From a paper:
Prolidases, also known as Xaa-Pro dipeptidases, are metalloproteases that catalyze the hydrolysis of dipeptides containing a C-terminal proline residue. Prolidases share a number of conserved sequence and structural features. These enzymes possess an N-terminal domain and a C-terminal catalytic domain, and form dimers through contact between both domains in a head-to-tail arrangement. The catalytic site features a binuclear metal cluster in the center of a pita-bread fold that is a canonical feature of this family of enzymes. Here we report the structure of E. coli PepQ, showing it to have the predicted pita-bread fold.
To better understand the potential significance of sequence conservation between the E. coli and human prolidases, we solved the structure of the bacterial enzyme at 2.0 Å resolution. The asymmetric unit contains a single PepQ dimer, which is the native oligomeric structure of this protein, arranged head-to-tail with inter-dimer contacts made between both domains. The active site of E. coli PepQ also features canonical metal binding residues, Asp246, Asp257, His339, Glu384 and Glu423, chelating two metal ions. Because PepQ was crystallized in buffer containing magnesium, the density found in this region is most likely derived from magnesium ions. Additionally, the mF0-DFc difference map shows greater density for one of the two metal ions (chelated by His339), consistent with reports from other pita-bread fold peptidases that this binding site has a higher affinity for metal ions. The decreased occupancy at the second metal site is surprising, given that the magnesium concentration during crystallization was in the millimolar range. This observation suggests that the affinity for magnesium of either PepQ in general, or this site in particular, is not as high as seen for the preferred manganese ion in related proteins, reported to be in the low- or sub-micromolar range,,. Asp45, which reaches into the active site of one monomer from a loop region in the N-terminal domain of the other monomer, is seen in E. coli to be within interaction distance of Arg370, with the charged ends of the side chains approximately 3.5Å apart. PepQ Arg370, which is projected further into the active site on one of the loop regions conserved in prolidases from higher organisms, is placed far enough into the active site that it would physically impede the binding of longer peptides, as seen in the overlap between this arginine and the PepP-bound substrate tripeptide. PepQ R370 is, however, in an appropriate position for the guanidinium group of the arginine to interact with the C-terminus of the proline residue.
Residue numbers in the entry:
A (entry chain A), B (entry chain B): 3 to 443
The structure:
């Protein structure tokens, strides 16, 4: 099943590659997995992060010095770095399903790749993180990471193959398990550090191989959007927990966010439940052929609803709240973004395979996606509401200050904020919510 | 007390810097903490690894875009990157023990540094991982990471101040706690992954912030010198555990290795005990004024003694065993190296402040230290005995094959290997074993 899906994946990628080579007048693409490099003045290596364009073809993510030659017609060729040394642990020559559709060739020495490459290299496009290596290998200067080919392929990354979707559902499983374990850790009164430990234990991940840094935010930290630190002692009293964490399977990411209240009978808990319901309703409105921006704006309308309902903003209609941008400081980020091999996946602004860029509207400058919904797309939906003094301050001084319930805002600050993130897949007649299909409350 | 020590530290570094600047004809050093950089084609950042030369002055290890300006006479100036935006964690400048000896100035934008630096930059030497940024700031290309100054400073990093020693002792405490918890995990039959969890829990480290990747090796994996993988299921039969792991405090590293046998009554357990005792005896022989190579060779003699005692190598004297290099494949690495801000600390081969280089002897090409011991040096002592087929097998094709007890070697291979590592401080008339002072058995 997964194997046959992978045969389709290879066929799709071969077609895209063939079209790209035809358009940009190239013979083939040489895709480099990457190389190790050390910290300044030290021999301490940075962790290896594989070229996304490399793992786009094959599930090999932990091996540098690998090389993929593709022409869209012949069987893809993979030179797989296989050093023989007693120092390091070395990955064996892979023989999994994918090796049936990809010709795997052992590469004992990294500098042995040059003699194995095609004789004529003048029309080969190199894609990889080491341009100097490409130049050494006889790749023409302009064929080193050519932006036209890269943009083309990125545009087509927007549309996931069935194999990719299967991989992403598998990542969803791991992330869900992690989130449940983390919630249990929170309920037990554990610190952010220990909660993180519980998440990693449940997922089988290390902090060095999660698709992105975990956000384990207790209380006020929930209002901190890029919170990546971990307190080693639990707060004096538990109030709230925002967890933005995910997982990875065959290079494909899940990226989930859940928010919990320590108590269930306060304003904050009610607000969390409301954000949940609004998120689900928004998703229920989603369909192909509609701009993603529409859904961003839509959630700002829902924010206006919640602000009015909870008496956070008073003496103003929801419509006027949106018109005057009062909802702006409460969700100062976008409703979400494409998801795939990368967490913030490529082509979020790209309208065609020629690289046409459509920026976010000035009113919502941090929106990461301006794409028309089409079947095959995988997108995050991550609405939130936060109470951030630096953003609220100018409002307190301005003409709309009287509309803000500063007392209640102060009362909500110690709870930080709320975000609820699912990952969905656009289909012809519906939207598949992978996260909720796994019943993550 | 740490404040007073730090004041002394500042005085020391000031004088070193003054002398270096006078010698290599510069007015000041501009030392850059570093910059974030992302994965190829992604917005996923690599973990931040501070410039060792930067944390050499101040205990700031997690903040990019910081700049130290030092002339060796006036109070050190530190522009501390302190951005004001509703993302990540917002807080004021540090007011810790070190902020009275250094002038700390908030830097809200990374590109604002250039207008805050002295106008005359023709004689300012840049030290940092971003030469391009130095060029942008008008630093002469020949003054970007100047070899003379860097080598000089590296040479003097060999001699730790009292502040540095204190920090290293704290790191020792952390690491010792980790090793104890890890041994306990091992005895309980836990997988490498769970043992690593236990280590991280006891030290309070993350995999992303350990000074070097943990080596958690069960059974045969102990024969793999750089084993940084983790099995998630415990092996069928527990036989051995080699743990090479450490900790960091104020940017200063501890690096410890311990080896345990599942059973206490077999040959392997006895060999582990013997290696431990021989390590301790070697350390008991250590003296200032003596070459480190002497101690490397000495431990090869001790290895010869053990191999003879255990009937692993037969019918050859210890002296002849060393002369013919039969002990070679049993410890294919150095006896140790300088330790400090970096794990493999600097100036290991550097004989003077002019950068004179003394290579390891050809017989022991992987020895990382050729220094004469002097008071204030911190060194690792990490002897080991391993059973590595790729290194042992060729001896069967040679004239000394008859001296190898291949049967016993075959019996010992399932246990992998043994390494016992302590971190020691050289003093005038004694050697301080920080690790054993903490009673890590
Ligand atoms: Mg997220
Ligand atoms: Mg997201
Ligand atoms: Mg060491
Ligand atoms: Mg070590």
């Amino acid at each position: 099943s997964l194997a046959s899906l992978y045969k389709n994946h290879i066929a799709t990628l071969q077609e895209r590659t063939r079209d790209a080579l035809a358009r940009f007048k190239l013979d083939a693409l040489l895709i480099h997995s990457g190389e190790l490099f050390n910290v300044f003045l030290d021999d301490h290596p940075y962790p290896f992060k594989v070229n996304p364009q490399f793992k786009a073809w094959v599930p090999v993510t932990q091996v540098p010095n690998c090389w993929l030659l593709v022409d869209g017609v012949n069987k893809p060729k993979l030179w797989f770095y296989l050093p023989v040394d007693y120092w390091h642990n070395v990955e064996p020559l892979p023989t999994s399903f994918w090796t049936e559709d990809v010709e795997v060739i052992a590469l004992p020495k990294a500098d042995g790749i040059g003699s194995l490459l095609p004789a004529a290299r003048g029309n080969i496009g190199y894609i990889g993180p080491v341009p100097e290596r490409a130049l050494q290998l006889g790749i023409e200067a302009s064929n080193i990471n050519p932006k036209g080919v890269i943009d083309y392929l990125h545009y087509y990354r927007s549309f996931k193959t069935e194999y990719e979707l299967a991989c992403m559902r598998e990542a969803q499983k791991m992330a869900v398990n992690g989130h449940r374990a983390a919630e249990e850790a929170f309920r037990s009164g554990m610190s952010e550090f220990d909660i993180n430990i519980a998440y990693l234990t449940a997922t089988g991940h290390r902090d060095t191989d999660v698709p992105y840094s975990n956000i384990v935010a207790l209380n006020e930290h929930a209002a901190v959007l890029h919170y990546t630190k971990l307190d080693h002692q639990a707060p004096e009293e538990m109030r709230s927990f925002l967890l933005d964490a995910g997982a990875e399977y065959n290079g494909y990411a899940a990226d989930l966010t859940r928010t919990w209240s320590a108590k269930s009978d306060n304003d904050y808990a009610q607000l969390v439940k409301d954000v949940n319901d609004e998120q689900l309703a928004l998703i229920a409105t989603m369909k192909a052929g509609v701009s993603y921006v529409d859904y961003h704006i839509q959630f700002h309308q829902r924010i206006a609803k919640l602000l009015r309902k909870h008496q956070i903003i008073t003496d103003m209609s929801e419509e006027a709240m949106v018109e005057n941008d009062l909802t702006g400081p409460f969700m100062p980020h976008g409703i979400g973004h494409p998801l795939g091999l990368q967490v913030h996946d490529v082509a979020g602004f790209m309208q065609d395979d020629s690289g046409t860029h459509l920026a976010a509207p000035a009113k919502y400058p941090y929106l990461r996606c301006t794409r028309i919904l089409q079947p095959g797309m995988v997108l995050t939906i991550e609405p939130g509401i936060y109470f951030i003094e630096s953003l609220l301050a100018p409002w307190r001084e301005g003409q709309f200050s009287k509309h803000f319930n500063w007392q209640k805002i102060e009362a909500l600050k110690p709870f930080g904020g709320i975000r609820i993130e699912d990952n969905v897949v656009i289909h012809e007649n519906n939207v598949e919510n992978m996260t909720r299909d796994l019943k993550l409350a």
